[PDB]
Structure formats: C-alpha cells, structure tokens
Design a protein around this ligand. Structure first.
Ligand code: BMA
Ligand code: BMA
Ligand code: BMA
Length: 391
C-alpha cells in the first residue's frame, strides 16, 4: 500500500457514497416496483420505460454489495426493493428462470430465456443472499444454476437463447454485419462471474466443477493464444465471425479470471489462468492505454477511440489487480490515471446525474442515456467496491 493508494480508495469510496449510491436510489419506482428503466441525456426519467431484467439484477447486485461492503441499511432496503421486483415480475413461476424484459408495470414484454440474463440473476441473487440471508434468493440462485447446467450447457459452452419453456433457439446477438453469433464472450464471461460468486458463498462441489469447467473454456476456446485478446462474437464452434478486439472485455476478463483462479483446486490450471490474466493485462496496457484512458475496440483494422463508461471502470479494476499481482508501478499509474480521466470527462457535472455513457475521441460528450437497459450501477459501482475491498 501507499499514500497514493490510500487516497485513491478514499476518493472512490467518497464517490460511491456521495454520487453513485444516491443517484441510483433516486431511480426507485415506488409506484410499480423495481427501478425506472430509462433516463435520457437531459436527465429526464421515462417512468413508463420498459424494464430490463439485466438492469434490475445489476441494481440488485449493486445495492446488495454496497450493504455487504459498507453496511448501509438504506442500501439493504434498496436491494430488497430490486429483489421483490425480481421475484414478483421477472421470475417465471410456471417454467422457472428470468424473463428478458417486462413493462414498467411488470407485464412480461419478452419472455424468452437468455443465459446472459440468468447469469446476472445468479450474480445478484447470490449477493443479495449474503446481504439478507433470504433462503428464497438462495433457492432461486441454485435453481438458475441447475437449469443452466442441465438445460443450457453443451459440449463447447452454453446455448445462449431459449424459448420461455427452455426449448433452444438461435441467438439474439448479431455481428455488425447481422450474422447471428451463436457463442458470445460476454454471455460466457458473466456465467463465469456469477458462478464465482455462487461458489464463494456456497462452496458446493457441483458449483465448483462448473466453475472449473467455464474457466477451462476460457483458457482453451475463448482466449486467442498468443494475442492477449479474447474472441468476441463467434459461430457455434468458437470461430470468430469477425476479427474484433474488445479492450473492455479483455481487461474485465483479466481480473475476473484471476478472481476465479483463487478458488481453483487444480494447481496447473490455476497457474495457467494466473499467467493468462497477466498476459492480457500487459497487452491491454501496451495496445489500448493511451496515457490517459483505455480505447474501446478494434474491428478488423478500424479502431474506436471513444471512451466508454464501463470500459474505463473495468480498466481501473483490471490494472489495479495487475498491480497487486506484479507490484509493477506502471499498472498502478495507469489505474489511477484512468480514474482521473473518469473524474474529469465521464462523471457528469450536472446536478442529479451520474456517469456519462461515453465521450468521443476528442473528449466531447455524446447524447446517450444515463440509465438504460444496458447502463447500470454495476460496472462503475463495482469499480469503487473492488478498490475498497482490495485496499
Ligand atoms: O441538467 C439537465 C440539463 O442539462 C443540459 O446540459 C441540457 O442537456 C438540458 O436539456 C438538461 O435538461
Ligand atoms: O408487453 C406489455 C406491453 O404490451 C404492448 O403491446 C402494450 O400493450 C403495452 O402497453 C404493454 O406495456
Ligand atoms: O450490450 C451489452 C453491453 O452492456 C454494457 O452494459 C456492458 O456490460 C458491456 O460489457 C456489454 O457489451
């Protein structure tokens, strides 16, 4: 540790408590339950917006984790609110598992079952169980895990999209030329993430075996050996549809794999994964860190230098994690500089706001929502919570 690292933690903790937590508390929907689904760039909440399950589970995870780390009783109450809406509106009582989306009143809008949604459900429900002791949350988390393992898993990963009654179908995620990606890194990344949290709290042998299995999948099939990059969108056999690098996915995967590795009982695999995580962090720092912040992606030979909120959040955690493992100050410097970038260019200066979705390559704000089905408190909230836990 150091004076810089201590001040870094204190700055992030203050930011979480004074900016992020009160903002998401203001999205609480006390008329219909859950949290409002949309807030535009002008800070206007669309109270009637459809409510995405992933967003609700991310809010459940966030408030639960805030309670677990900060012991804020208000956060526990906010988590309960998200949990009630999950169990009452997103949980399918007839066929089990979580709907994709509901209306602002909770009427099912999209009842298909996606592994991406189920994974975030496990992640949020397991965190909420730690916060509350609610064995209903535990039961739903275990049931989601059982369904993924017994209905969705295949020899080379998970089939990602199902009908409401769990009959498989083609995926809903597309390449930028419109070809269905039957295997996606971000679906499988969040399975890994949720299984790590579930095993951390339960330590059951079935969960451990599934955690080792998905870690092995990342090492053997998803990682592009020798490149520091993971495949993004693939066919059913983990062949890339396009040569795409997502620097944000890479650096997130780096520290999530390193975290899962701490539970591995296979020493060989553990050493492989810890080595992989570091190789990714090093290549991310070399290729994607511009001295201020991380760029977004490269699709074939076209580089997107936009600064995206979640990319920068995961960069802070991934570089700090690499610093903890290597003690090489270059990673610590990159992590703090990225935070200083976030503070100056992505934290919204307006009252009653939070983080901007992105700024462009010239650091200009782009009209994008502050809250949306894909913009959550989870990436940036977790950035603060991780540093608090690790320092
Ligand atoms: O503070 C909110 C206001 O901030 C400004 O930048 C504009 O986008 C306004 O339309 C918006 O209402
Ligand atoms: O799925 C629920 C939605 O279904 C639509 O067809 C409309 O009736 C909406 O008012 C409703 O919110
Ligand atoms: O559209 C999915 C996107 O949603 C965002 O919130 C992030 O989690 C990204 O990692 C992801 O690519």
């Amino acid at each position: 540790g150091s004076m810089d690292i201590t001040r870094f933690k204190e700055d992030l903790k203050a930011h979480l408590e004074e900016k992020i937590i009160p903002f998401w508390q203001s999205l609480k929907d006390d008329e219909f339950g859950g949290y409002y689904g949309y807030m535009d760039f002008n800070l206007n909440i669309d109270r009637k917006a459809q409510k995405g399950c992933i967003l609700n589970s991310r809010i459940l995870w966030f408030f639960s984790a805030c309670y677990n780390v900060l012991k804020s009783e208000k956060c526990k109450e906010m988590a309960f609110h998200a949990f009630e809406f999950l169990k009452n509106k997103f949980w399918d009582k007839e066929y089990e598992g979580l709907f994709w989306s509901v209306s602002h009143k909770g009427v099912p809008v999209d009842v298909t079952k996606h592994v991406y949604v189920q994974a975030f459900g496990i992640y949020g429900l397991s965190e909420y169980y730690e916060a509350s002791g609610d064995e209903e949350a535990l039961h739903m988390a275990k049931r989601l895990f059982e369904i993924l393992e017994t209905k969705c898993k295949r020899e080379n990963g998970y089939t990602e999209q199902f009908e409401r009654n769990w009959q498989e179908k083609e995926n809903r995620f597309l390449s930028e030329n419109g070809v269905i990606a039957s295997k996606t890194m971000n679906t499988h990344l969040h399975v890994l993430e949720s299984y790590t949290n579930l095993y951390r709290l339960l330590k059951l042998d079935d969960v451990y075996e599934a955690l080792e299995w998905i870690v092995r999948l990342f090492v053997d099939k998803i990682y592009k050996k020798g490149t520091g990059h993971f495949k993004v969108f693939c066919d059913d056999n983990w062949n890339e549809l396009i040569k795409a690098v997502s620097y944000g996915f890479d650096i997130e995967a780096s520290w999530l794999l390193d975290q899962a590795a701490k539970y591995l009982k296979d020493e060989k695999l553990k050493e492989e994964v810890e080595k992989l995580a570091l190789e990714v962090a090093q290549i991310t720092l070399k290729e994607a860190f511009d001295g201020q912040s991380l760029i977004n992606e490269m699709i074939e030979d076209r580089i997107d230098r936009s600064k995206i909120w979640w990319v920068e959040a995961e960069t802070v955690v991934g570089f700090f994690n690499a610093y903890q493992k290597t003690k090489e100050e270059k990673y610590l410097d990159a992590a703090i500089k990225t935070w200083e970038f976030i503070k100056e260019h992505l934290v919204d200066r307006r009252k009653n706001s939070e983080w901007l979705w992105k700024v462009n390559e010239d650091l200009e704000a782009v009209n994008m929502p502050i809250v949306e089905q894909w913009k959550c408190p989870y990436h940036n909230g977790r950035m603060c919570l991780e540093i608090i836990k690790r320092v």
